[PDB]
Every structure is written in structure tokens, then in C-alpha cells.
């Protein structure tokens, strides 16, 4: 069918080949998954050797990481922002590997606030009025509060993350191949990675 | 694909000149003396000797 | 050889390769033109159908009339004057007879007294012309 054949192609020299054999099976191509943002539709394939392969066609949740301080949480993907392959696979909201995506921050913000006890994002004047995590900013013993303060010495976050966390939308990079594994996992961008990709978003956008 | 041998070789060589008087009348001198029936029975012996005599030439080239 | 260099393998091979074409026996066998224009198409023998019985005047010196047979070959539709061997064997060839026809002996060259006749008739109506001449087989009619 859609073939993956070396023999249809011109030789190094520029001279073109003749086919000595007809298309083999093991030279499968399959159509592109072209997975989108939406409610989970993951088709299974049967592939070479009676193995399974998970065609993501719609995928929203993703087990993204926050490497800076080791945590990784299942988070809703909201947008595709940038792709180093095509400018169309941003217009057409297609998740592929090394996509730049806006994801939710609230699992990461809930973690940061349930580990360092510091309100993160959250504008001044705007208190937490319902009284949920006002309970989880106080109420320790002596030496447990001491442990949190010794740990709190190392709770400075970057200016870029602190701005992204305010909108409730972090930028993350897909490290999985959703067409193959059927997962939209990856890592949150930090440092010169995030500086580079924010400049490229800014370059194309404006 | 079959379970047959196929391996078979000639046991004589026909001589190059077919009408050397000297050969024709030396090979009939052999046939009379020793009561053989055709020149194939002579070219058979001559060929065995020639193969022996070829193998000997091959070993005399080699170092002692 | 006129280049005894130790590193001259290709000049010596590529020269010999080029100069083999100036041989007749090679040029003949290694082109289609000799194998195409061959009336037999590179075959040893060929069945054809007698369309007339032809007297051919022998060469300059000796002077008989050589009794040959004009043949339409089946495989090609090609025209052949093929000689008939021994004394009084043209009496065995009715017209429109399927004859098996061989070469004369010189690999498609004209033989003896017979101008531009390269072929002899071997069998007539699938009965051997030696067997008819010796009278062993009788002609089935």
C-alpha cells in the first residue's frame, strides 16, 4: 500500500532503480494518526509480530513533568502553541512529539502549595475566600513547621514560571509519540528552553 | 529434487589423429598379443596410466 | 602487449575488449545482425514447405544443374533455396511438402558449385531422404 521502500528511490549517483520485487508487507506504511485535542479516542493497531500500537486520534490528558523540583502530574492539554515541523500543525491543533502545548497548572500549583506552603500565582488583594487551602498554609506543630521552613529556604521559582502559573496555563513539550504509544506525556519547559520557545511564539505571532 | 547419484566419468580418450599408421598398427599389436576386443579396451588402459602418470608429474613438482 | 606496467590491468583488458570487435568470428556471434538475418533464427534445422523445385546452374569450372527446392520456412515465413542430396532425390519431393532442412556444412556459407544455397533437404513429409534413397522407408501418400 502506502510503502516504506528504499528501492522506489534514486541511487546516491542520481541513476534510478528498477523494482526486482513487488511491494512487500513488512514495508508497511500506515496513515498518520494526526491526533487532536478533545475527549479520548485511542484506536489500537495490530503491528509486525502480533504486537499492539495505540493510535491516539483525540487526546487531552497528559502525564507532564516539572523537572526543576521532581514532580509529574496528569494534566489537561488546552492548546497547541508551536511546532518546529510545520506552521500548519499549530493552525490544525495536531499533537505530535516536540509540540509546544499550553497545559493546566493547578495540579502543579496544588503540589507547590502542598509542599512549600506559599501562595503561588494569586494576585495581591485576591485572597482565597472559600477557606480550603488557607487551612493548608498554616496549622503545623513545632518541628514540622521547622522542617517546612528549612525546606522553604529552597522555594524560589523562576519569573517566567511565576507569570505562566498566574494565567493557570504552563507551556510543556510532548516527549511521547502519541500515534505510537497513545499517550501525550512530556515535560514543562524551564530556563533557556522556555526563553527560546517564548521568542519563537512571539516571532510567529506578532 | 531426487535421491539419484548422477556422478559418472569416461574411462577413455579418443586419440587426436584418427589415422596414424604407427598408432593404428601398435594398438592392434596390443589387441592381438593380449586378446582385447576393440581400441576402447586399449584407450581405457592408456587413460588409467595417463591419470596415474598425471598424478606422478604433480607429486614430482613438490619438495621432498 | 605494449604496456607492461604493473598497474595497467584496465588498459590491457579494455584494449583487448575493444580489439575483439575487429575479429569476424567474434563480431558475428556477439551482434544480433548475424543471428537476426540468419534465416533459421540461430536454429540447427528448420521445417519448411516446398513452393517450387529449382534448377541452379553449377559454378564457372564444372557445369551441372544442381536440383534445389524453394522453401517457405514455417517459424519465420522466410524464403530459402535448399539443395536436395544424392542422385534422383528431387523425384521424392511433391510440391507443398513439409521438408526438414539443415545447413550445408560451412555455418551459413555457400558450398562447392552451388551459388548462394546454404541448405540441404534432410527429411520430406517427416520421412528421411537417405531412407527414401536407400529404399528402406516408402513415401506415405
Amino acid at each position: 500500500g502506502i510503502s516504506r521502500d528504499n528501492w522506489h528511490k534514486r541511487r546516491k549517483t542520481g541513476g534510478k532503480r528498477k523494482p526486482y520485487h513487488k511491494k512487500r508487507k513488512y514495508e508497511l506504511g500506515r496513515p498518520a494518526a494526526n491526533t487532536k485535542i478533545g475527549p479520548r479516542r485511542i484506536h489500537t493497531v495490530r503491528v509486525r509480530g502480533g504486537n499492539k500500537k495505540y493510535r491516539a486520534l483525540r487526546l487531552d490528558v497528559g502525564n507532564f513533568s516539572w523537572g526543576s523540583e521532581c514532580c509529574t502530574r496528569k494534566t489537561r492539554i488546552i492548546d497547541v502553541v508551536y511546532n518546529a515541523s510545520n506552521n500548519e500543525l499549530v493552525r490544525t491543533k495536531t499533537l505530535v512529539k516536540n509540540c509546544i502545548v499550553l497545559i493546566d497548572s493547578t495540579p502543579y500549583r496544588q503540589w507547590y502549595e502542598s509542599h512549600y506552603a506559599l501562595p503561588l500565582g494569586r494576585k495581591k488583594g485576591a485572597k482565597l475566600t472559600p477557606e480550603e487551602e488557607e487551612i493548608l498554609n498554616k496549622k503545623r506543630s513545632k518541628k514540622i513547621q521547622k522542617k517546612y521552613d528549612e525546606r522553604k529556604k529552597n522555594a524560589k521559582i523562576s519569573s517566567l514560571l511565576e507569570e505562566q502559573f498566574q494565567q493557570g496555563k504552563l507551556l510543556a513539550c510532548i516527549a511521547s509519540r502519541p500515534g505510537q504509544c497513545g499517550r501525550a506525556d512530556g515535560y514543562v519547559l524551564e530556563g533557556k528552553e522556555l526563553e527560546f520557545y517564548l521568542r519563537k511564539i512571539k516571532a510567529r505571532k506578532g | 529434487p531426487v535421491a539419484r547419484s548422477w556422478v559418472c566419468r569416461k574411462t577413455y580418450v579418443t586419440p587426436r589423429r584418427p589415422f596414424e599408421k604407427s598408432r593404428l598398427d601398435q594398438e592392434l599389436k596390443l589387441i592381438g598379443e593380449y586378446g582385447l576386443r576393440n581400441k576402447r579396451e586399449v584407450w581405457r588402459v592408456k587413460f588409467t596410466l595417463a591419470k596415474i602418470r598425471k598424478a606422478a608429474r604433480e607429486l614430482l613438482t613438490l619438495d621432498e | 602487449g605494449k604496456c607492461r606496467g604493473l598497474r595497467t590491468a584496465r588498459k590491457l583488458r579494455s584494449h583487448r575488449r575493444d580489439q575483439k570487435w575487429h575479429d569476424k568470428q567474434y563480431k558475428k556471434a556477439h551482434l544480433g545482425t548475424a543471428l537476426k538475418a540468419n534465416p533459421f533464427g540461430g536454429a540447427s534445422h528448420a521445417k519448411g514447405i516446398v513452393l517450387e523445385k529449382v534448377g541452379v546452374e553449377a559454378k564457372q569450372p564444372n557445369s551441372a544443374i544442381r536440383k534445389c527446392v524453394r522453401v517457405q520456412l514455417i517459424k519465420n515465413g522466410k524464403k530459402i533455396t535448399a539443395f536436395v542430396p544424392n542422385d534422383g532425390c528431387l523425384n521424392f519431393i511433391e510440391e507443398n511438402d513439409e521438408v526438414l532442412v539443415a545447413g550445408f556444412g560451412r555455418k551459413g556459407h555457400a558450398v562447392g558449385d552451388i551459388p548462394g544455397v546454404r541448405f540441404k533437404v534432410v527429411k520430406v513429409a517427416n520421412v528421411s531422404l537417405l531412407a527414401l534413397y536407400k529404399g528402406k522407408k516408402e513415401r506415405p501418400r
Binding site: - | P1, V2, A3, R4, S5 | -
Partner: protein, 262 residues
């Protein structure tokens, strides 16, 4: 072919089996097993060709399906089972026990042993890896995967294993001076002390082996086994003792035996 071959042509068969070229088109294709196609001696060939109990292959069916042939400790009802190097074939009703060790001429000899000897075999280790939870695993030449071996056992060693349990007893380190049965190439069946392993990084490591008569030869490492500590072997050897006396020596030793015996 568009999938795995199930036949083996008689003329394509490995030379050491010594099948003729007039009985059939096909040789027995060895059943998939511990040993390679080119290195195994199938059971049928050990029954009808060597020991000559059976005549046909249907006879070998009528012997093996009665559950008599016990190849290294376990009964085998497969006529084309790949019995290979060091494996112990126990025919119980005759009270006979055979170890498949190479004659100094390429072919496997029929080498009878004591039942006391038959209880153990000797296995060349192919590699070591560390399994799922720090558990050291240990793969041999007949693929006997052993978990928790002695930690001083390295890649090219041998291990004297008990057949009735399948546990190691003692192991021979691959060191210079140790005996060596060569199990591949032109030097197949040769026995001698290991002299110099010469390391070739990226390529194959050649290994020199000095003979008992002093006729030193060499082999690629992969074709080399170790059968003893220094000069003393851990098996019983087949007669000739893996020397390979030359065609001239074989000729005059046939002449000497042919006249002296009568």
C-alpha cells in the same frame, strides 16, 4: 521464502552427521532446541545411524515414544530433538549412558560413561546479566538459564551442573593453563592447555591452545570450551584424547593394528 523453513535437504545437512546421498532427498531437520542446527546431533541420527538399534525412522518413533531415551536427565519423545555438546543420553532399559563429546575428527563419537558420571554435565556460560530485581541470571551454551550463580563466575567459564536438580557444583575460570575441547572450526574435537588468549577489541579474540604432544594450534575464542583444571579433565575423554594424529600417523597406525591384531 515468506516464513520459516521446515525442511532440510540431505545434501545441505551438516557434514559431521555422516548421512549418505542415496537414501532420501531430505535429512531430519532438527527440532528447535538448546543447540544450533549446525552443531546439534538429532536423536534419530544417534539411534538409527550411530548405535544402530533402529533401522528406519518409524522404529525411532517406536523407541522414543515408549519414553526410554533420557537426554541430560529428562525424557524426550521428539525423534529430531537437538542433542548437542556434553549432553548425556541415558537409555535406561539397556543401562547405557552416553555423553556427546566431539571425536578429534569433526564428528560426535559414541562415548559410553558410568551412571555415576552421567549424574552431572559441564556447561560453557555464554553471558551473565542481572535480572528483574538485582537477581544475577546466567545463560549457558545449551541455554540452561541459572538464577543466583556464584558471583566469581564470568562470561567464558564452565560450570559442573547436577542434572537431577540443575544447580552448579564447581566452576572452571577461563585462565591460561586450563584444558580445552575446541567445539568449532578446523580444530573441532582437539584437546589441549590454553596458552595465550590474544584480545582483538571490536573483532574476534583468537586463543592459542598447546596440545598434549606439543602440536600447538589456535582458534577463535567462541569455538573454545574448558573441560579441566590444568591437565586433569572433569569428564571421561573419548579414545585418542583429542590429539588428531596426522593422516600419515593414522595410515601406519592402521597398518600396525591391521597386522598386529590379525
Amino acid at each position: 521464502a515468506r516464513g520459516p523453513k521446515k525442511h532440510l535437504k540431505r545434501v545441505a545437512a551438516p557434514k559431521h552427521w555422516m548421512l549418505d546421498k542415496l537414501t532420501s532427498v531430505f535429512a531430519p531437520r532438527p527440532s528447535t532446541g538448546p543447540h544450533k542446527l549446525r552443531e546439534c546431533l538429532p536423536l534419530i541420527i544417534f539411534l538409527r545411524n550411530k548405535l544402530k538399534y533402529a533401522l528406519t525412522g518409524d522404529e525411532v518413533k517406536k523407541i522414543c515414544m515408549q519414553r526410554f531415551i533420557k537426554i541430560d536427565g529428562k525424557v524426550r519423545a521428539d525423534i529430531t530433538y537437538p542433542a548437542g555438546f556434553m549432553d548425556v543420553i541415558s537409555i535406561d532399559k539397556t543401562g547405557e549412558n552416553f555423553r556427546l563429546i566431539y571425536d578429534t575428527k569433526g564428528r560426535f563419537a559414541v562415548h559410553r560413561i558410568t551412571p555415576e558420571e552421567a549424574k552431572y554435565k559441564l556447561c560453557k556460560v555464554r553471558k551473565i546479566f542481572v535480572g528483574t530485581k538485582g537477581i544475577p541470571h546466567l545463560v549457558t551454551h545449551d541455554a540452561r538459564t541459572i538464577r543466583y550463580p556464584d558471583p566469581l563466575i564470568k562470561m567464558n567459564d564452565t560450570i559442573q551442573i547436577d542434572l537431577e536438580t540443575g544447580k552448579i557444583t564447581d566452576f572452571i575460570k577461563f585462565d591460561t593453563g586450563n584444558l580445552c575441547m575446541v567445539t568449532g572450526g578446523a580444530n573441532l574435537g582437539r584437546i589441549g592447555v590454553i596458552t595465550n588468549r590474544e584480545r582483538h577489541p571490536g573483532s574476534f579474540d583468537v586463543v592459542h591452545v598447546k596440545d598434549a604432544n606439543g602440536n600447538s594450534f589456535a582458534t577463535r575464542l567462541s569455538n573454545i570450551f574448558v573441560i579441566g583444571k590444568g591437565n586433569k579433565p572433569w569428564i571421561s575423554l573419548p579414545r585418542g584424547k583429542g590429539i588428531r594424529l596426522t593422516i600419515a600417523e593414522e595410515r601406519d597406525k592402521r597398518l600396525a593394528a591391521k597386522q598386529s591384531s590379525g
